[PDB]
Amino acid sequence: KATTIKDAIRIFEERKSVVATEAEKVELHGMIPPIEKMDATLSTLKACKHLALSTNNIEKISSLSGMENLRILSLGRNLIKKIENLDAVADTLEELWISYNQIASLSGIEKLVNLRVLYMSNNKITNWGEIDKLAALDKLEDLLLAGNPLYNDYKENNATSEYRIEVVKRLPNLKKLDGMPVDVDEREQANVAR
Numbered sequence: 001k002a003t004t005i006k007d008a009i010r011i012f013e014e015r016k017s018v019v020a021t022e023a024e025k026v027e028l029h030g031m032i033p034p035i036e037k038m039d040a041t042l043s044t045l046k047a048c049k050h051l052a053l054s055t056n057n058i059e060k061i062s063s064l065s066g067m068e069n070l071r072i073l074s075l076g077r078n079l080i081k082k083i084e085n086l087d088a089v090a091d092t093l094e095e096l097w098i099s100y101n102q103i104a105s106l107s108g109i110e111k112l113v114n115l116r117v118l119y120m121s122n123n124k125i126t127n128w129g130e131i132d133k134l135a136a137l138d139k140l141e142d143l144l145l146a147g148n149p150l151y152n153d154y155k156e157n158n159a160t161s162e163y164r165i166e167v168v169k170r171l172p173n174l175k176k177l178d179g180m181p182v183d184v185d186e187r188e189q190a191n192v193a194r
Contacts, residue, residue: 002036002057009041022047029074030055038063050074054097064088076100076119083108090114099123099144106133115140121178122147131170141175143167151178169194 003011008028009020020026026048028035034057043066045051050072058078064070065088072095073086080101086093086108095117096109104124109115116139125131125148134140145151145167154163167177168190174182 002033003031004037005035005039005041005063007031008035009044020045024048025050025052027052028056029053040065042067054078061085068092071095072097086111094139095119099147104130106130109133110136112137113139117142119144120148121145124148125150128166128170131167135170140171141173143171143174143176144178146178165189165193 005028008031009026011031012027013020016027021044023045024047026045029052035053036057036059038053038058038061040063042051042063045067047069048067049069051067051070052074054074054076056078058075058080061075061080061083062085064086067089070089070092073089073093074097076097076099078101080098081103083103083106090111090113092114093112094114096112096115097119099119099121102124103120104126106125110133115137118134118140121144125145127150131150134143151163154160164177164186168174168182168186172190172194176182
């Protein structure tokens, strides 16, 4: 019943009139019935730079081998709980878009050594120890955490400004946070405290 990767690719090729093995952006989002599993058919997407698997029912990241040029992995609005099984794309992946999932731990994110952009609004991160795990990512410049419990804690206390300083204290070279540039004043506040 669930849409398979093979079937979603066929739907995409018919909608976009392209050969999916040659496409840079492969649009597999919002299938009806939803996709539930990533699988080995993804290995056929040899040209893919942006894989859009958002708005499905995927529970597990898997099956990313064979996409040698993948830059953007888009998995927002699924049922994912864990960052894992990304080794096959770590050498090229620059952006992980995974907002509106159920991720409570950032363990595993450290394998994405080339990551520049992490969009993960509306997940289940509750505490600063998870954010500390992002400090290893030397190229991370754009981060979205809005809607996670940790973010909401500060918003509930009208202290989002304080939350932003705490992020930049941990991530000193971050350039953009929750869609808003890190202001020089925020960087200096984080510095004079760090």
